[PDB]
Every structure is written in C-alpha cells, then in structure tokens.
C-alpha cells in the first residue's frame with residue numbers, strides 16, 4: 505500500500521533514507537534518499553505501486569535501462585542512469601541518479617510561463633540526440649512529455665519582466681536527461697494498441713495504423729510547442745476532438761490514412777464525423793488556429809523553430825522527419841557555430 509511506505513525517515517533496503525518526495529504519477533512515487541552505503545550520495549528512488557500493470561512496466565523499464573546504460577556508460581546520450589533495483593514490502597523500487605525538476609514542474613512553478621528560445625534550442629537538441637540514441641537501438645520511447653524530461657540541475661534566477669508584467673524564472677543551465685522507460689518498446693516486441701499520453705499522441709497511434717519510432721518525433725514536436733507557449737495546442741481529453749484540433753492546426757488528414765484506418769468511429773464517409781456547432785466544436789474553433797499563428801515573433805530564429813515543429817508534425821509517419829535529420833535542421837546551426 506503506497507501511502508504506508510513512502511515517508512521521510514523511512515529506510516529502504518537497509519541503506520536508502522527518505523528525505524523528500526520528488527514526484528508522484530500513475531505508477532507510484534519518486535522519493536529522494538540518502539544512500540548510506542555510497543558515502544551519503546543523494547539518489548532518486550521510484551517506488552512502484554503493487555499493481556499488475558505498473559509492476560510489468562517497472563520490470564520492463566529495468567531491462568531497458570540495463571541495456572541503455574551498458575550501451576552508453578558515460579551517459580553521452582542523456583538517458584537517466586539506473587543504479588540498482590530492489591523490492592520493499594513487495595514493491596519494486598528502482599534507484600536512479602538524482603536529477604532536478606522535470607520540465608513540466610519547472611514550467612508549473614514558473615506560473616506556466618514558457619522557456620526562452622535559446623533554452624528551447626539547447627533542450628530540443630539534447631532531447632533529439634537522446635531519443636535518437638533510443639531509435640538507433642531498436643527502441644521507441646512512446647511516452648515522451650515534459651514530465652519525462654528532467655533538468656540535470658534546475659537552479660534559476662528570477663526577475664520582473666515588465667514586457668509581460670510578471671516575475672520570471674530563468675534556468676542557469678538547461679541541460680536535460682530523459683526518464684521513464686516503462687513504455688519503451690523494441691522493434692520486434694508486441695506493440696500496444698494505444699500509446700502515449702493524449703496530448704503527445706501521434707495520428708497513426710490514434711488511427712491504429714501501426715506505430716514505430718516516428719510517433720516519438722510527433723511527441724517531441726508537441727513538447728517543443730508546449731515549451732514555446734507554456735501550454736498545449738491540443739487541450740483535450742477526447743480522441744475525436746484531438747483529431748479535430750489537428751485538422752484546424754495542421755490542415756486535413758491525408759486521404760490515405762483515412763482510407764486505411766479501422767477507426768471508423770471517427771469518420772463519416774471520408775471526413776471527420778465532427779459537428780462544428782456543438783460545444784466541443786465551438787471550443788475547437790475558439791481554441792485552435794493554424795500552427796504558425798501561434799508564433800510570438802517573426803524573427804528568423806522563430807521561423808526556424810516553427811519550420812522544424814511543422815516537419816515533426818507531418819501526419820504521414822514515413823514522410824515525417826527523423827531525429828537524425830532533425831539534428832541537422834537549421835534551427836540548431838546556432839549551437840554548432842565555432
């Protein structure tokens with residue numbers, strides 16, 4: 505029972521003393537501990553609910569991390585390092601290096617203000633390089649979202665911004681790592697019918713056309729929008745509504761994808777089965793507009809970012825830019841300047 509076992513001062517595995525709670529998700533909790541058998545190092549321990557599906561995900565996460573961490577022992581590609589795992593009162597507990605705030609929690613604590621463009625550029629490059637390393641190893645993450653991208657160290661400076669009448673926090677160092685490999689799937693493994701957290705889910709996933717590495721690229725494009733704006737451009741908890749928002753932001757779905765899909769519930773003949781005058785229809789009309797209308801500036805660096813996002817949000821997953829190609833996009837040139 506999760507509440508019974510996650511308390512400050514509790515000691516796990518005769519070595520890890522809980523000092524704080526770092527996060528809680530569907531899966532259980534992540535706590536910060538002092539490791540009394542590694543010289544007092546502070547670590548993060550993910551305590552998994554004793555529930556079938558979360559236990560299975562944790563076991564899978566341990567297998568993937570063992571692979572990724574052995575393949576990349578210097579963490580050149582920025583996947584979180586797993587230190588060990590154990591069981592505590594029947595719960596699986598995974599020990600990680602300690603990181604800073606998730607990118608989501610940073611934005612939340614900053615009043616849902618967005619990141620500045622130079623930080624987005626650096627973060628995007630590192631996200632793309634890390635996930636590309638997964639892709640090179642026959643893996644797809646499937647659950648990329650701001651909560652699963654963590655700052656290495658989230659110290660900030662703070663200043664009033666009169667341009668927007670608000671106190672603003674700015675990272676000192678925006679370096680990141682990628683976490684949460686409990687949904688990561690190898691190319692030759694069973695692919696779950698549904699993947700991703702809704703706001704980051706690709707159209708081939710929604711339409712059950714089959715998914716692979718490209719679905720991670722879509723999620724990354726969605727994450728970059730959220731970093732740029734401070735909010736999602738897909739504010740919905742309904743699949744058909746999500747497709748409608750895609751249409752308004754990105755244009756009509758390709759005919760071949762509507763042709764091929766078994767998800768007939770979404771469609772009336774060859775068009776989305778969508779009433780523009782319903783409550784949901786009025787909201788999508790208010791809340792969505794073409795992608796480039798969300799730009800905050802027409803400066804060329806903003807145009808470069810939006811060009812990349814647009815490529816990442818290509819509907820056809822084969823046509824969609826790969827991460828190897830994304831790393832070569834002009835948006836990143838500023839990082840490669842001598």
Ligand SMILES: O=C1N=Cc2ccc3c(-c4cccc(O)c4)c[nH]c3c21
Pocket residue numbers: 526527528529534548550584600601602603604605606609651654683684
């Ligand atoms: O320092 C870390 N090293 C590995 C790791 C994994 C997850 C987390 C979260 C977290 C988890 C769920 C929700 C949330 O908002 C934050 C915070 N710190 C984490 C670490």
Ligand SMILES: [Cl-]
Pocket residue numbers: 804805806808809834835836837838
């Ligand atoms: Cl640029």
Ligand code: NA
Pocket residue numbers: 768769770771772773777
């Ligand atoms: Na239908």
